[PDB]
Amino acid sequence: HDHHHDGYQAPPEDIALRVKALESLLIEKGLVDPAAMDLVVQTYEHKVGPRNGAKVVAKAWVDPAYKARLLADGTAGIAELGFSGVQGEDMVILENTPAVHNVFVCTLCSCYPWPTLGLPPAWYKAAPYRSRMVSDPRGVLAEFGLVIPANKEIRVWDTTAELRYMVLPERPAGTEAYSEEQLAELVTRDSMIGTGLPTQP
Amino acid sequence: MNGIHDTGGAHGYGPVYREPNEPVFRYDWEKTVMSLLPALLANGNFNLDEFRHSIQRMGPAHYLEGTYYEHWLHVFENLLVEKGVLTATEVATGKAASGKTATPVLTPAIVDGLLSTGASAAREEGARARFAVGDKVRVLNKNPVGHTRMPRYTRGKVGTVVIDHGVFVTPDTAAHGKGEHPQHVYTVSFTSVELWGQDASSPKDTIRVDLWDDYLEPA
Ligand SMILES: [Co+3]
């Protein structure tokens, strides 16, 4: 059938007018500044996105000292690369290992590490992913083409508080002496949410 | 609040469909809606906890039918009225009652600095930590009509404290003008079996949830 509740359903036909009406109201009252709003939009449209987290991952892969700092203090760790702020004030980095596969969700809404991954995709914020991720992780991951070994523990982290999580994926095999930049290219958004793995060369 | 937003463990929402090559913003109007949040938070028109609870309070069908940013639009149209920042009439007509009576706190000069800094919910001091990592804890069975961050699926369940994150504002009180009542927040680890039962579980899998100190009791 149609999309209904997966986040990709069609908005009401008059939604853009409703939004314009409220915006005018707020501007007229002096509550908001359009110019500042434009800067906010530009920030999340062009400046902040998963490339940020990718740089964090790549650096951690090549620099064990940085990795240790990052795992000890996520916020300070990502700050070394100039990433910080709204919805990433108190970061916790989750290390994937041969024994543990991490993945995170916000069952209650949409909490997500903006400074390293940017704004979340619609699916992350919708009922299908949020409802099922905490009960049948394997079933959900299978839908993304990811099958976790049966003997590997999956840890699902529900973002119910003001801590924000990002996954440090495992470095793909056969990437010897890659530069941080080549490694960063392999780090997908999904790999940092835990709903996928880094690209295999 | 035991509302439709508390989705954990629900059935019937179906497959996780995902758009290939999804843009940050799928419609122009979403840009306006999204950028309004930082603007209004900066004014101190409401706090984030109030924002969350306002979304929880929209009609259940409205919540399911509405795309994500329609949730935000709802908060702006309703929470601003509840807080006395706008009147119903103003919202309905889209025409201000009496001109530019305020001054925007979020100005172009501070956008970058404000966004880069944000506002941590961590606090210097608060209630002492009752639990240590390794402690077995049970989530209290509470069913507040107001805002809370203990998901329905964890209530009454037993888990293991795996991280003490330190002291944070308490959303339950901050959303209802009862102060911050800062206290510790822990990550608590629950087994798949403990949460979902023998049949519906996988032996390896664990679910970790961040819970405030007074949500818990010794197991
Ligand atoms: Co959320």
What secondary structure, in 3-state letters, does chain B show?
Answer: CCCCCCCCCCCCCCCCCCCCCCCCCCCHHHHHHHHHHHHHHHHCCCCHHHHHHHHHCCCHHHHHHCCHHHHHHHHHHHHHHHCCCCCHHHHHHCCCCCCCCCCCCCCHHHHHHHHHHCCCCECCCCCCCCCCCCCEEEECCCCCCCCCCCCHHHCCCEEEEEEEEEEECCHHHHCCCCCCCCEEEEEEEEEHHHHHCCCCCCCCCEEEEEEEHHHEEEC
8 Å CB contact of B29 and A131: no
Gap between the Cα atoms of A37 and B113, Å rounded: 14
> Which DSSP letter does residue A109 get?
S
Resolution (A): 2.3
8 Å CB contact between B52 and A109? yes
Core vs surface per residue B129-139: b (16+ CB within 10 A) or e? ebbeeebebbb
Core vs surface per residue A42-72: b (16+ CB within 10 A) or e? ebbbeebbbebbbbbbbbbbeeeebbeebee
Domain with CATH 2.30.30.50 in chain B: 122-219
Residue among B14, B115, B205 whose CB faces A154 most closely? B205
8 Å CB contact between A101 and A197? no
Structure-block tokens of residue B131? 């639990």
Place of tokens 């009401």: A12
Gap between the Cα atoms of B202 and A42, Å rounded: 44
Gap between the Cα atoms of B130 and B109, Å rounded: 44
Domain with CATH 1.10.472.20 in chain B: 1-118
Gap between the Cα atoms of A184 and A64, Å rounded: 16
8 Å CB contact between B125 and B167? yes
Mutate one of A17, A44, A107, A153 to test the B interface: name it (highest B CB count within 10 A): A107
8 Å CB contact of B70 and A85: no
**Residue ranges near ligand 1 (ion) with Cβ within 5 Å:** A 106, 109-111
> Cα of B34 to ligand 1 centre, how many Å?
14
Does domain B1-118 bear CATH number 1.10.472.20? yes
Gap between the Cα atoms of B3 and B60, Å rounded: 7
Query: Which residues on adjacent β-strands are paired with residue A166?
Result: A93
Gap between the Cα atoms of B59 and B160, Å rounded: 36
8 Å CB contact of B68 and A163: no
Q: Residue B14 region, left (φ>0) first, then alpha (ψ -120 to 50), else beta?
A: left
Q: Of A182, A177, A121, whose CA–CA distance to B18 is shortest?
A: A121
How far are the Cα atoms of B11, B168, B195, B213 from residue B138, in angstroms, in the given order?
A: 25, 20, 12, 11
Q: What are phi and psi of A167, to 5 degrees?
A: -90, 130
Gap between the Cα atoms of B63 and B75, Å rounded: 12
Gap between the Cα atoms of B118 and B149, Å rounded: 21
Gap between the Cα atoms of B140 and A125, Å rounded: 27
Which CATH number, 3.90.330.10, 3.40.50.11540, 1.10.3720.10, 3.40.50.11310, labels domain A1-201? 3.90.330.10
A5 to chain B: which residues are within 8 Å by CB? 13, 64-65
List, in sequence order, every beta strand (DSSP E) within A14-123.
91-95, 100-105
Gap between the Cα atoms of B44 and A69, Å rounded: 35
Question: Structurally, what CATH architecture does the domain formed by B122-219 represent?
Answer: Roll (2.30)
8 Å CB contact between A83 and A115? yes
**Strands across the sheet with B206-212, in order?**
A100-105, A153-158, B206-212, B183-191, B158-168, B136-139, B216-218
Q: Of B72, B10, B18, whose CA–CA distance to B200 is shortest?
A: B10
Query: Which residues on adjacent β-strands are paired with residue A66?
Result: none
Q: Is the dihedral of CA A133, A136, A137, A138 positive or negative?
A: negative
CA–chain centroid gap for B67, Å, is: 17
8 Å CB contact between A55 and A81? yes
Structure-block tokens of residue B59? 């009609």
Structure obtained using:
X-ray
> Which DSSP letter does residue A47 get?
I
Q: Which helix (H) or strand (E) holds A87?
A: none
8 Å CB contact between A164 and A193? no
8 Å CB contact between A148 and A101? yes
Gap between the Cα atoms of A183 and B63, Å rounded: 40
- Judging by DSSP bridges, how do beta strands B158-168 and B136-139 pair with one another? antiparallel
The verdict on B127 touching A (C-beta cutoff 8 Å) is: no
Structure-block tokens of residue A197? 């793995």
